[PDB]
Design a protein around this ligand. Structure first.
Ligand SMILES: OC[C@@H]1[C@@H](O)[C@H](O)[C@@H](O)CN1Cc1ccc(CNc2ccc(N3CCOCC3)cc2)cc1
Ligand SMILES: *[C@@H]1O[C@H](CO)[C@@H](O)[C@H](O)[C@H]1NC(C)=O
Length: 765
């Protein structure tokens, strides 16, 4: 019944619009398979289309906004695109129809409406691009009856091992088709839907824009060669209409031109299922999925006061659909340095110059191929899996579909190498590499990242203790199933735990350092003079200079998080020998956190280093780092230290802004310095941890109950309203928020952990 729930899950989630890197496209969860993609662009001139065409997501003044209004990866959803440059408000409805043996069917409607600014007679080129990889697979455009292209629907017939037989139909659609009176129409038609079937080597099929353009260019070249010139040129839109040449191949370009508003449908029908999908099916299934989304939201994301209002409901729906709608399937090679150069051991003073020398050797090679099913921080900027990010992405996702969240966890944990390492950044394939500068591509086996994924596991454990509907919760409703999942994953958790202790170990025994345990001390590998990327807080101030004797209180607290999870799960599995080891370790971290990181002078936790005279010095920078033992739920509710941190959290002269907790205190000397990335701005993921922990303390007998309750109340209010106001004004979730103005800044479309705001509003932790 485990293999059984897993098969149903496979079959449920197989198809989706799993390529978040482009405005609209589909692929299944198979590395080499069938993929689709949308492109559109107005054409006003002979040279304009190349600049107007849209394919991959970006964010600039050209594009007012875009994102999912509703989305469930099991059912589908609706996306809105507001394109200023192209004068177009576009809608992409995508829906899945279960049935057959090949992971169901699906269908999409593309609607375009000219906005009030656009010339009512705008010409907009639309393209649907279809590709197939695999050695023993086939795809054919059925030719049209008419000479120059299609009056009606385009039908592609295809077969593959993974998909069996299928047909994919691009319908004729509603909208005016411009007609050309030029001579050229004697050879190219007056204007009509056209199909070009091509073949390239598989590994380049992803490069839709160049492949399209190569075809467009050959078309213009043809015109020049056949004496169609400036003496009397065809209309631009006719110049960019491809000559119709359907056939078979691994690429199929379907192209339409519309004047004014337009719409058309894609109907993918698995032959494995019953009758083929129809447009009338698309309409029904879309309507029904909306109703299902509606019900589920109100049940799973019941917004509590003061956010019960519809305005906040719309807000929550937008933040949630954009987070979950970013889910993607990625496939390909990673770039990894597998040298394990000794300089990465970072055992010297000046180690950053050593590690740069080993990097300068360029031993990194491609390896894999790998696959990952994951949500993502940002469609336009960061369309790929980030390890500690996903920790936050999955917390609301888990509420919505726990079976979904566990798939994504499973997916992430399957990338782990024999040592226990998962690269913090998953760049899989040439496609995924295209949106990443060479400098950032290479992964390093010594670089960790917060194990925020254990948080989600924690929530599942607590839920496990206490057909699309059924599937979504099968892993808590069937305890046998839950446990079996944990049994299989547990080895990997423990592996990773040990990997932290082998690779991220701090140096006690070699200095003047007394403390309750000889074992417990952690230091992030990977740090440079001004950064510690691996920690998540890229430019939070750390001991200067960086130094092999550093200890990092955030890292130690993360290890804390892991052991608490390991206790819970080991118990559930009865790994008794294990659960005793964990208990001794937890005990030691609790003590060592105090002995090695607590500053009575300053009233908070601190990183450590070793002095010029080789003695242990605390280095205190009051901000997120300083709160870590508390954010990670390690502190006893009656602790004087907890209470001292509540003073810090609440104190407006340090971290308490009207808009949330500042990453760094106004008092610190690094406040608003350098890039000011984690050096003042409000970050929603770290605020979320605080809000959750405050609520913990508030809902328990203890000396800090009523202080916590008040901070909770205000922080929840502050964070939500800041994100909401910004959403209202700008349409976007932002990466961080400005503590002085409340303005969102850095990156847009960050959903992304900002979306955590949905869970914050719904409350009752
Ligand atoms: O959310 C992810 C991550 C969190 O894990 C961290 O905690 C947080 O501190 C930072 N974030 C975000 C993050 C920030 C920087 C990088 C690398 N720089 C980089 C520079 C330019 C591009 N471009 C892509 C398209 O446009 C032109 C070029 C892309 C990347 C990666 C992620
Ligand atoms: C889905 O099923 C196929 C065939 O049974 C299998 O190759 C694949 O591993 C499954 N996908 C995963 C692991 O998500």
């Amino acid at each position: 019944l485990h293999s059984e729930i897993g098969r149903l899950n496979n079959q449920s989630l197989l198809w989706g619009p799993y390529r978040p890197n482009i405005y609209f496209g589909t692929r299944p969860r198979i590395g080499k398979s069938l993929m689709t993609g949308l492109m559109w662009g107005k054409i006003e001139s002979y040279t304009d289309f190349q600049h107007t065409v849209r394919y991959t997501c970006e964010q600039n003044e050209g594009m007012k906004g875009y994102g999912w209004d509703e989305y469930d990866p099991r059912r589908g959803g609706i996306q809105s695109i507001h394109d200023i440059q192209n004068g177009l408000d576009i809608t992409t409805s995508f829906v899945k129809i279960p049935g057959g043996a090949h992971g169901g069917s699906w269908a999409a409607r593309i609607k375009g409406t000219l906005n009030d600014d656009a010339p009512k007679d705008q010409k907009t080129i639309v393209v649907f691009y279809v590709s197939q990889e695999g050695e023993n697979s086939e795809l054919e455009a059925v030719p049209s009856e008419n000479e120059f292209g299609y009056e009606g629907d385009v039908i592609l017939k295809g077969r593959s091992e993974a998909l069996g037989n299928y047909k994919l139909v691009v319908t004729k659609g509603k909208g005016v088709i411009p007609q050309s009176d030029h001579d050229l129409s004697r050879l190219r038609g007056p204007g009509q839907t056209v199909v070009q079937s091509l073949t390239y080597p598989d590994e380049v099929l992803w490069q839709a824009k160049p492949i399209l353009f190569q075809q467009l260019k050959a078309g213009i070249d043809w015109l020049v060669e056949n004496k169609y010139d400036v003496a009397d040129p065809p209309p631009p839109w006719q110049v960019y209409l491809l000559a119709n040449k359907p056939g078979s191949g691994n690429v199929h370009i379907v192209q339409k031109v519309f004047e004014g508003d337009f719409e058309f449908d894609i109907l993918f029908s698995s032959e494995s299922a019953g009758k083929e999908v129809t447009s009338k099916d698309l309409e029904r299934e879309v309507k029904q999925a909306t109703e299902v989304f509606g019900e589920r939201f109100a049940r799973v994301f019941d917004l509590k006061a003061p956010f019960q209002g519809d305005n906040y409901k719309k807000f929550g729906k937008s933040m949630f659909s954009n987070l979950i709608g970013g889910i993607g399937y990625f496939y390909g090679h990673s770039l990894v340095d597998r040298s394990y150069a000794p300089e990465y051991d970072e055992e010297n003073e000046g180690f950053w110059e050593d590690a740069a020398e080993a990097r300068a050797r360029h031993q990194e090679a491609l390896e894999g191929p790998y696959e990952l099913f994951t949500s993502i921080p940002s469609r336009p900027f960061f369309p790929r899996g980030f390890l500690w990010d996903e920790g936050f992405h999955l917390l609301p996702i888990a509420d919505w579909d726990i079976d979904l969240a566990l798939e994504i966890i499973k997916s992430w944990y399957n990338l782990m190498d024999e040592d226990g390492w998962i690269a913090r950044e998953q760049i899989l394939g040439a496609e995924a590499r295209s949106k990443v500068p060479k400098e950032f591509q290479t992964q390093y086996p010594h670089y960790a990242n917060p194990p925020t994924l254990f948080l989600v596991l924690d929530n599942f454990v607590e839920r496990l203790r206490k057909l699309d509907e059924t599937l979504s919760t099968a892993s808590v409703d069937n305890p046998e199933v839950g446990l079996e999942y944990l049994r299989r994953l547990y080895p990997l958790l423990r592996r990773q735990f040990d990997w932290f202790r082998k690779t991220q170990a701090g140096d006690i025994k070699s200095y003047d350092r007394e403390a309750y345990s000889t074992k417990e001390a952690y230091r992030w590998r990977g740090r440079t003079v001004s950064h510690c990327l691996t920690s998540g807080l890229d430019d939070y101030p750390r001991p200067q200079p960086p130094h092999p004797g550093e200890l990092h209180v955030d890292l130690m607290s993360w290890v804390g998080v892991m052991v608490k999870s390991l206790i819970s799960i080991g118990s559930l599995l009865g790994a008794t020998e294990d659960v005793e080891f964990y208990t001794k370790v937890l005990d030691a971290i609790e003590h060592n956190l105090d002995d090695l990181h607590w500053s009575e002078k300053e009233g908070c936790y601190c990183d450590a280093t070793i002095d010029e005279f080789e003695e242990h010095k605390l280095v205190c920078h009051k901000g997120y780092i300083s709160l870590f033992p508390f954010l990670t739920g390690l502190l006893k509710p009656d602790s004087p230290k907890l209470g001292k941190l509540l003073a810090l959290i609440g104190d407006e002269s340090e971290l308490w802004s009207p808009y949330g907790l500042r990453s760094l205190s106004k008092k610190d000397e690094f406040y608003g310095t350098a890039e000011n990335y984690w050096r003042s701005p409000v970050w929603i993921n770290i605020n979320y941890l605080a809000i959750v922990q405050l609520y913990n303390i508030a809902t328990q007998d203890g000396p800090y109950k009523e202080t916590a309750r008040d901070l909770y109340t205000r922080l929840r209010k502050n964070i939500v309203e800041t994100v909401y106001r910004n959403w209202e004004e700008t349409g976007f979730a932002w990466e961080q928020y400005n503590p002085e103005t409340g303005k969102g800044q850095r990156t847009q479309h960050f959903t992304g952990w900002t979306s955590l705001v949905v869970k914050i509003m719904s409350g009752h932790h």
